[PDB]
Amino acid sequence: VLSGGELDKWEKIRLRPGGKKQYKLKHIVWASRELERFAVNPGLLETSEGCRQILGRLQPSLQTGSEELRSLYNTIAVLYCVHQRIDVKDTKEALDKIEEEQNK
Amino acid sequence: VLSGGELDKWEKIRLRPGGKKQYKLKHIVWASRELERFAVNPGLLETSEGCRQILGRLQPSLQTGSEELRSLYNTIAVLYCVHQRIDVKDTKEALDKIEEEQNK
Amino acid sequence: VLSGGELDKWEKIRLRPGGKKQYKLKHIVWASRELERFAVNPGLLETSEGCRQILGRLQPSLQTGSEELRSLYNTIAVLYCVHQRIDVKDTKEALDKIEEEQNKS
């Protein structure tokens, strides 16, 4: 899913703003299993364009989405930023960037 | 999900028109678990507007929906009517009243 | 889902073009359970019209869909062709023939 350089960036990103815990490999495994449970191709996680397609497929479900769906969306937003080489310190900054790109 | 006065109303409502069996607390517990399973926020059951948003989210699936999906929709339609202080005797009257409001 | 005559045709249909493995009853059982998991009425597998409604419900998810979702769609496409008495040798021919029928509009 991620190259060696992308994995180094991934594991520096904090789960919550100002928190200590950071993303791990297991979050990518979890996201991949989650997409399977939602009948979405986990192979889309491998590219920026694939993550964009996943976010677009999930976005109409966000307003009413459970905590599980929101966490999945947030995780793939971070992955999109890592693929795009966008520097983000935490999950919220990636969501900010997703909103900014969509509005552009 | 329901206040004390609302729960008293809930348990007078008949599952079927003219039937003996009536709604119970377990139907609310079940509906909350069902929404989590469909990745919908169960906290939306707590308000009229939240129930309205659930019904709109589920409605495109009704035509081809399984028995489980239709029962879930019907239960939340009754819950919407209870939150709105709309007096209904049974599930069918709740569905009738919601369709007429939608036509307005 | 299928009559006895339909089951005989079903089990002659190849999963892949020119392949050896063929459709089995377990594919119908599996398709029926999959639909329940997707909150779709499995009784719709019993008729041509019901199968058309399922395919229409699933088709927008195909582009981003998992392997499981695509296999389910393809299985139901084959089942639609069997209900319609459309002769198919394999899954790919069933998808092709369904596409041609839609283009007649």
Numbering used by the authors:
A (entry chain D), B (entry chain A): 7 to 110
C (entry chain E): 7 to 111
Quote what the paper states about this structure.
During the late phase of HIV-1 infection, viral Gag polyproteins are targeted to the plasma membrane (PM) for assembly. Gag localization at the PM is a prerequisite for the incorporation of the envelope protein (Env) into budding particles. Pioneering X-ray crystallography studies of HIV-1 unmyristoylated MA [myr(–)MA] revealed that the protein adopts a trimer arrangement.
When mapped on the putative hexamer of trimer model of MA, these residues were found to point toward the hexamer centers. It was also shown that substitution of residue Gln63 with Arg suppressed Env incorporation defects of the L13E, E17K, L31E, V35E, or E99V MA mutations and of a gp41CT mutation that has the same phenotype. To explain the role of MA trimerization in Env incorporation, it was suggested that the Q63R mutation in MA may stabilize the trimer structure such that MA lattices that form large hexamer holes are favored over those that feature small hexamer holes. To be able to assess the structural changes in the MA trimer, we determined the high-resolution structure of myr(–)MA Q63R protein by X-ray crystallography. Interestingly, the two crystal forms of myr(–)MA Q63R yielded structures that are essentially identical with slightly different parameters. Each asymmetric unit of the crystal structure contains two trimers. The structures in the two crystal forms revealed only minor conformational changes in the loops connecting helices I and II and helices V and VI. Intriguingly, the guanidinium group of Arg63 is 2.5 Å (averaged across 12 examples in the asymmetric unit of the two crystal forms) from the hydroxyl group of Ser67 of an adjacent MA molecule, which forms new hydrogen bonding in the trimer interface. Our findings complemented the biological data by showing that the H-bond formed between the side chains of Arg63 and Ser67 is key for the stability of the MA trimer and hence to its function in rescuing Env incorporation.
